[PDB]
Amino acid sequence: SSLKGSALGKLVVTSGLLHSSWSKILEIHNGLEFQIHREEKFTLVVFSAFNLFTSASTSLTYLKSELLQTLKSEKPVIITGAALGGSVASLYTLWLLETIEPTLKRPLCITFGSPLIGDASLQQILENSVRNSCFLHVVSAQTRIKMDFFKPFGTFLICFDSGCVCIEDHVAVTELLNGVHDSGLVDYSQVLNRLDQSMLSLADSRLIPEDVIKGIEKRAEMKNLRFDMMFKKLNDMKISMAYIEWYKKKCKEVKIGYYDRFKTQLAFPSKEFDINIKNHHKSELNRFWKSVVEEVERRPQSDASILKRRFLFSGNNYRRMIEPLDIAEYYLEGRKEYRTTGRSHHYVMLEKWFGMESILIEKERCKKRDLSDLLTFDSCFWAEVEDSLIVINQLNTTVGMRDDVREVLTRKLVEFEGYVWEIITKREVSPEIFLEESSFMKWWKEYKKIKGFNSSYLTEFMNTRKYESYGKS
Amino acid sequence: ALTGINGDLITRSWSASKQAYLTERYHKEEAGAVVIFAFQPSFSEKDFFDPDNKSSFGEIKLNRVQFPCMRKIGKGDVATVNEAFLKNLEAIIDPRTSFQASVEMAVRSRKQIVFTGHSSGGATAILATVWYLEKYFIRNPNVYLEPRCVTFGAPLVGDSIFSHALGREKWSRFFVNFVSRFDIVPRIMLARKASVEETLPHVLAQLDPRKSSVQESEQRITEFYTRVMRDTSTVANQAVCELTGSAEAFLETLSSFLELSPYRPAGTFVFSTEKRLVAVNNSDAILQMLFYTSQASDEQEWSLIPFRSIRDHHSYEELVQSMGKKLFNHLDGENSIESTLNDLGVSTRGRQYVQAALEEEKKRVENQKKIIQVIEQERFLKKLAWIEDEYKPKCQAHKNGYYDSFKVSNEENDFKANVKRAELAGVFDEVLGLMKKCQLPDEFEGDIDWIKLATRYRRLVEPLDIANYHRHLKNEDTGPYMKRGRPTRYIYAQRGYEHYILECGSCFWAEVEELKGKPYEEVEVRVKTLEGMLGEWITDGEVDDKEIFLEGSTFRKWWITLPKNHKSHSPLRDYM
Amino acid sequence: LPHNLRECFLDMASFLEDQRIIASTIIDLWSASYGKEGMNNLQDLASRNLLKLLPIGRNEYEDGFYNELLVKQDNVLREFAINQCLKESSSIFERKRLNLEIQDNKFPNWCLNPKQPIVINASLFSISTDDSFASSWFEMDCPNVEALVLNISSSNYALPNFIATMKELKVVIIINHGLEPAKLTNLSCLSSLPNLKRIRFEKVSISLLDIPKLGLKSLEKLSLWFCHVVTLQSLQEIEIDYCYNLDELPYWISQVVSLKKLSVTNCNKLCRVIEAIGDLRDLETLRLSSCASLLELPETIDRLDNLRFLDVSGGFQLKNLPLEIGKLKKLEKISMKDCYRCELPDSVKNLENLEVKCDEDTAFLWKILKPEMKNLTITEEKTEHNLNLLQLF
């Protein structure tokens, strides 16, 4: 039942948080003058459209220092205001949290009957994210707020004849407060007194209809179903990745990298296993991981941990093993600059999360283990190679080219060679790149034909045939 | 009745409590074939809130040497209890206490024994009975010593973990707590130490049964009762919210700035009406009812509640003598509890809350039933049977253990093995996650069949998981397997197994993966340790010798590459 | 060993060694030989260890799905069968089963310098030409032959003209072994044969729009496999799968009433089907599976009346299904597998005795409406993993 809302309402009306905040607001009232009334622990500070926020930014730039200090101090931070001061405080707290870290104690912004124009885009961005957990509003059952461009953001506490009830369903909140706005604003002190009297009362009646609770329960059940369904489908995704593992093994057995094999198959389909791998497994894992990265980003699985290790470690391998296929597909259509121009979002998100997490690890690698089963760390590596190939063509087919573009391409080639030599020295690339019929050998042949007499570390390493003993021991 | 107690025993307990009502700490009463023990109460504010600690309520973590079974096998965290009561128990349980000789002579007599107390000694009786169960009952199955603890409105002396532990061991049924409708003593400990720090002295003085000439200040008593009931209402609302599960983010944000006592009812409770007696066994339901049974009825009732709260604490003789004529109703037996909810004086709020608690209990029971049904299917056991008697024998005949064959996956059977391992791991981790959110009965983790199944699954799969982890160089990117690579399910299974029989051979291979390659001296000691444990492991079936001592197994190669003196002075010389 | 099984084995021995064959191919091959009971003989031969079977895809085999069963043999068995066939054959025309292989673009020595009209009365004739050979036609004719198979590998191939001389032929199989699709021409030679029943094409470039214009008098089943895209009186079954570049099915298939079963699977580049499909009054089974680009089904599906089976498993991007599926009364079985993200309209309430095949995740889609509907039973089947696709790979 939805009464659970009113349940926590009781608690939010039992503590003197709202009462003390309203008393301080009345004292300050009875000009962006952010009066800080933090006595011992709390950070009670009243806020005194976009133009108002832009103007107040002058003092907000300095107040951010004290805000961050109080946040790091672990003291309770409360930010509220009037109809316009409340909206200004909501904007300030939203910006602070966008710049603040979720690790520390998150703030809470209460609006004292303060109308705020909420763009539908902003509401959809943080629809089910933890952001709304910081925003709460006061709306009396008598007065309503009818808006078209604006949208309700955060949770709303609707009063009644005796008591109050908190909710956060956007559609339900809109349907409840769908009524037109009333100019007459009852004294918030009278509302607080009535709420206190109701709390002291014996019993209270229910006013929420059945449709509201029906929709709320439907949304909760559907979200729980999505949660558990993704959790369970993780295992089927691992099982499907096992098939890609076996396919890569079989391709390696043929003396041809799986990347070039998949590229050739996409260019000229000639078998069924490749089509099944490209249209059955990859398309499912991509969608699953996209949905995961899109839904978890809103409301993380745990506080201070964007996601459990079971998911992050698996996603890292998924990326490092699948990104080459996306790079091949992107470079097969003619487009260039995959790393910067056409790289997906979930790949970068997973890479950044892994880089931020594994920093605390104390891993250690030996100089004797075999690298036959290693996975390239720089997933975009292949992409770079492709780019270089284009340059090679631009140096062979193109005739009568200006010296400026010539030197630019030469510098690009030399920098790519240096990068590849550096990545090889650190032993962070699988030996599969050294396969016979792989694109790497073609690029090496092109670079050798275009080099002439210039020699470097990579040139000698390739000519000496040492690459045969790269990962074998 | 179902409680296992009768009238004469309750009368004897009340008589012993009245006798021990003096300053004497321990009082013994030997009637028939039962030696009841009563403890002295205390009416000083210092006896309730220990002035030595800094906690806002007086919580303290228990030690391992004393209460090994009072822990969460999964999380492995000790529970918290009151400090003053624990200190009183430890003082009355010292060598000079003379209680040890009496308890030993009683256990030798093979007679029934009960620990009772009226206001606070009874609370200590709990701290005693649990001890009596942690030293003789659990460890000595030879005895039929089912203790009996009876309290009369004793404050909470245990948190959620305490009740969980009492339930997981099937000991909750050995407790009984009679409480009147208007008795603020059990709820006193639920109030804040500072909110009632002032009124606490006068309240305790007035509550003193011996010294009843205290000037009862109506204003102070009313304010203290209001504060206690307000904090109880806050904690009850928090509990009902957390049980609903909705608005977890907002709930945590609000709790970040709020404080609540972690105490929770332990054992079965029984509320006494003017003519009827109701019984409840659910902790959450008891907590929810503790606040609504004493809710303000009206202005006159809200003003007279102080006198009733002050008098009912001593009026226990009324019900102890009238128990002969009264109505008994098990709230769990009947479902439409409206009868008792109306005849006692609770409103629709507490009715709905207790209903929700009952439905949650039923839902967790149904979840346990569904888990049992899904684990009893032959389609599940077939995977384990195959991995056991189809995969290992073939590899063994191939002159190599299944571990190495799984590492170098070159046969089709390896794909099926990996698929089965992944499916089993997924199912087990799903069950673990379902059990971690407190959605299964407490007795579930105590079952023996489930423990044996988990132990078998671990002993069969963990080597495959280690092979899959080390065969793809996952440790290089995530670190050692024994730190951030081992799944949580295996840890819980190992802990449960180690607790039932009273690091692990399963991770043996893991160790073999670290010492390999590094010098012998820098690991000598470590190696030695292994050479010992592994030995006894071969005797406990944790590791089959037919696998490690094989020809192509990496263990034999590593042991052969070791120096000569090590093989000279090691007991494993015979096997090679 | 039964004589029928021995004959079936000697006929199956026509294929070359080290070739992954599909059950449907051999079934259509020996269809007219021993009626429509080929699966029984195949299973009997497999039980005797003579042949090896491998389920590639759906494990369901009794349902008649002959597209997920690979057949593999041993080199020794094939050699013994070839030796027995050669021993049985005593003359050019006397041999009932004769296989030819004109390697290096060189015709057989016998037919190389033939004086009289080369005509062999062999029930099964097999010709294998390498990609190097020009595959030029010669002077010959098949007086008594029921089935004909062709193993080609050249990029361009023109069927010879003497095939028109044949009059007892019933089914022809054209298998291509090449990295790129082959080009076929001179198909008019097949439109004149009035005794042909089944036609099968694999890994070839063919113009579907030209099929009806060919004028196939009496042909029953048309099977497609790895087809490169660029009146039918007795057509009843059209099966197409693993054909890329087919962005949309043709329109001629909407003007054939005799068509009974039509199922296209594993066709990625197919997003929308021709809406003019309700004209198929005698449509009993429609299987659209393993198609990702397909998100919606033909809304005008209620026109069909004699619909008994409908399978859409394989498409995860399917948004919804026909809103008026309940209008059809003959619907008895539906298998909606591996289709999680999709909503089913309440119109399913107007259906009884429906066995819905699905899995655990899709089972809830029906459990939500179990009490409302009567005479509907769900069946959850867990897939079985294997590496048969690698063997096919």
Ligand SMILES: Nc1ncnc2c1ncn2[C@@H]1O[C@H](COP(=O)(O)OP(=O)(O)OC[C@H]2O[C@@H](O[C@@H]3[C@H](O)[C@@H](COP(=O)(O)OP(=O)(O)OP(=O)(O)O)O[C@H]3n3cnc4c(N)ncnc43)[C@H](O)[C@@H]2O)[C@@H](O)[C@H]1O
């Ligand atoms: N180079 C490669 N070359 C070719 N193929 C590869 C390669 N690499 C992978 N594949 C294949 O990718 C497929 C996907 O499996 P895959 O790549 O996803 O790997 P696998 O699932 O087959 O096996 C992984 C092994 O590592 C242990 O599993 C733990 C544990 O299961 C969970 C803890 O979390 P849990 O404790 O269980 O639960 P939580 O609630 O989250 O705990 P909390 O965070 O405290 O809250 O993490 C897991 N875990 C720990 N480290 C990693 C890691 N580096 N990668 C993935 N998972 C990891 C366990 O020993 C298992 O053998 C597999 O089939 C691989 O064969």
